[PDB]
Design a binder for this molecule. Structure first.
Ligand SMILES: [Zn+2]
Length: 105
């Protein structure tokens, strides 16, 4: 199955095999308080990121979870968020679909 790389630089990030259907669907379309819309795809696992700062519960799109911004560890592109502090699963990643490129493994 296909893998996901950072659109800006090609860093390996995740895999289609690691999609996670949260609340029944791997895709959630959401807005932040600055009104930016995101098509977030949920993955159980990702790599090649760099998580910035400390976790926050504020404005979390997923109930019970705290988030941290996740950048591409290579180019710094904002690729999504890491979620933790929750239940079933405790942790996962929400990645912005249009910031990733999908392709062969
Ligand atoms: Zn990148």
């Amino acid at each position: 199955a296909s893998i996901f790389r950072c659109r800006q630089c090609g860093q390996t990030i995740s895999r289609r095999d690691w999609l996670l259907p949260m609340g029944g669907d791997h895709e959630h379309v959401v807005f932040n308080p600055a009104g930016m819309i995101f098509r977030v795809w949920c993955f159980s696992l990702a790599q090649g990121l760099r998580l910035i700062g400390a976790p926050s519960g504020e404005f979390s799109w997923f109930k019970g979870y705290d988030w941290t911004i996740a950048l591409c560890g290579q180019c710094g592109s904002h690729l999504g968020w890491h979620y933790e502090g929750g239940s079933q699963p405790q942790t996962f990643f929400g990645l912005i679909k249009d910031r990733l490129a999908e392709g062969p493994a």
